[PDB]
Design a protein that fits this description.
The chain has a single domain, classed as Roll (Ubiquitin-like (UB roll)), CATH 3.10.20. The chain has a 5-stranded mixed sheet. A two-stranded antiparallel sheet has the order 4-6. Strand 1 and strand 2 form a beta hairpin. It is 18% helix and 32% strand. It has 3 helices and 7 strands. By secondary structure, it is α+β, with helices and mostly antiparallel strands. It binds FE2/S2 (inorganic) cluster and chloride ion. The site of chloride ion (CL) has 2 residues, from loops. One of its GO terms (cellular component) is chloroplast.
């Protein structure tokens, strides 16, 4: 399966295709979109986003509190789409402060 990932970025809204076993960040980078990252391993705040519609599988992530996952935050370097999904990007600040 291949899913449509819609990114809501501070610059605007863009959609890419992302295979079901490709991390969202990597589909963005493969499309020419520069989204932030640092560890690329699921253990930092840098690539954080917020799921506003649909679902992901981000069981390879460790950094987020279940409160944080329950509120919709996702680590894009560690999240597979499981449906068409819309993600607000550049939410590092919100999962620190
Ligand atoms: S870049 Fe560190 S968790 Fe994604
Ligand atoms: Cl879907």
């Amino acid at each position: 399966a291949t899913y449509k990932v819609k990114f809501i970025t501070p610059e605007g809204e863009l959609e890419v295709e992302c295979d079901d076993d490709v991390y969202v960040l990597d589909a963005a980078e493969e499309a020419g979109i520069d989204l932030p990252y640092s560890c690329r391993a699921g253990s930092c705040s840098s690539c954080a986003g917020k799921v506003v519609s649909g679902s992901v599988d981000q069981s390879d992530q460790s950094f987020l509190d279940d409160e944080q996952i329950g509120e919709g935050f996702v680590l894009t370097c560690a999240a597979y789409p499981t449906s068409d999904v819309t993600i607000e990007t550049h939410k590092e600040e919100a999962i620190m402060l």
